[PDB]
């Protein structure tokens, strides 16, 4: 889709999470942004090594009808605090609404 028919309701990832390194005990954040032409309930999920992070601390943002236009902008920030060697793995963001789910690139986290 696009703006011609204002038909991109599925989330469109615009910012990918990035592969990072962190020291044990530090705080780590992963960010993923998306856009949509639909104002529909959104769901933000994060996974580590193909498994859901059920009690993940998140900071989710929705800018609906930005500047009075027809665009929706979203950002989800995964917050990892006091990271352990067990925090190491491939992190992935899943952004979805009832039109579809969009899967981010897998961002590797290395813990030293």
- Residues 39-98 touching Cl ion, rule: CB under 5 A, are 49-50, 90
Question: Could you say whether residue 79 binds its own copies (CB under 8 A)?
Answer: no
Least Å from the CB of residue 69 to Cl ion: 22
Any contact of residue 88 with its own copies (CB under 8 A)? no
Nearer to its own copies, 87 or 104 (CB): 104
Figure out which of the listed residues 67, 85, 86, 112 binds its own copies, where binding follows CB under 8 A.
Answer: 67
Q: Which of 49, 32, 30 is nearest to 88 (CA)?
A: 49
Shortest separation between residue 41's beta carbon and Cl ion, angstroms: 18
For the CB of residue 64, give the shortest distance to its own copies in the complex, in Å: 10
């Amino acid at each position: 889709x696009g703006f011609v028919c204002d038909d991109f309701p599925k989330p469109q990832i615009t910012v990918q999470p990035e592969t990072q390194s962190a020291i044990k005990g530090s705080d780590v954040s992963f960010t993923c942004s998306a856009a949509s032409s639909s104002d529909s309930p959104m769901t933000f999920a994060w996974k580590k090594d193909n498994e859901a992070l059920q009690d993940a601390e998140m900071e989710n943002y929705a800018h609906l009808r930005a500047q009075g236009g027809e665009l929706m902008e979203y950002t989800t920030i995964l917050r990892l605090r006091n990271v352990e060697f067990t925090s190491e793995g491939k992190y992935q963001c899943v952004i979805s609404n009832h039109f579809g789910s969009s899967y981010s690139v897998k961002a590797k986290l290395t813990i030293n």
